[PDB]
Amino acid sequence: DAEFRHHSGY
Amino acid sequence: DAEFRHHSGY
Ligand SMILES: [Zn+2]
Ligand SMILES: [Zn+2]
Prior knowledge:
Two copies of one chain form a homodimer.
Chain A: H1 3-6
Bound molecules: zinc ion (2 copies).
One zinc ion sits between chains A (3, 6-7) and B (1-2, 6).
Organism (chains A, B): Homo sapiens (Human)
Protein name (chains A, B): Amyloid beta A4 protein
């Protein structure tokens, strides 16, 4: 995965 | 964390 996948936030 | 931190190995 990538940074966007590893990092989550809504 | 970064790609290097998220992932492991060579
Ligand atoms: Zn990654
Ligand atoms: Zn990251």
